[PDB]
Amino acid sequence: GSHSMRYFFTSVSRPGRGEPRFIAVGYVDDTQFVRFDSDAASQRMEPRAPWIEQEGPEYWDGETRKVKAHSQTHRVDLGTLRGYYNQSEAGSHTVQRMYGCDVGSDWRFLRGYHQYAYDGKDYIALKEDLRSWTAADMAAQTTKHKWEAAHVAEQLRAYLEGTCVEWLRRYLENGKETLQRTDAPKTHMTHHAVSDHEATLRCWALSFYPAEITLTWQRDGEDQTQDTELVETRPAGDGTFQKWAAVVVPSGQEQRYTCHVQHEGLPKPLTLRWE
């Protein structure tokens, strides 16, 4: 189906001593493929997926140079933003940035994004037109005028629509054995009595990829949300994801209840009933 490349950057100031903690991660779809951590020893961009390891020295040198540049820009911004908000030098603050591009099934550019936050709140973001800026407050408005004057959106648009998608396509090809493979959820139902006349049915979806999934309960063929619990989709730790949905039912009435599973790796949705 469709695909994305995304990078995430976090800088956290350290008022007591030294420079901010800086962590950057890159993803293709739901697969992390690179990382940089200012606390780590290498001080280089590092691979985190097999299909990126084939990239040569020129690649790693450039990604390292670029990611360090991001870190220094963030470091300066922490100082600037402290000033904009008239904040003390005593507190720790955070800058977050994320950017990426999406492509469709034909691998053609679909959309781009580039957004920036201070202390966990929207600060400034590129609009979907890749031309305009959303500034959340008057400090961000100051930044917006600066970025207009510096032709920032133009450069970002060029990257997002061109370079970003070109390299995404490259990665999709090189890592095709996993990146272009869907892993359908392995599903089963468990049963846990909660009294001598009621029980929890838990519908499990395991080892799936990508993370996107829908789990729903029906009772007698109609959606049921009352007396249900749905946990947030969670990483298994091996590149796949997990989720479950549960419903409390009167014991003996389990057969009324069906769990429905929708996932990209399933040609048709699955239906489960307590066995």
């Binding site: 670029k66 300066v76 904009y84």
Partner: peptide
Amino acid sequence: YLDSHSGA
């Protein structure tokens, strides 16, 4: 492949 800056 990272983007190749303007400060806040």
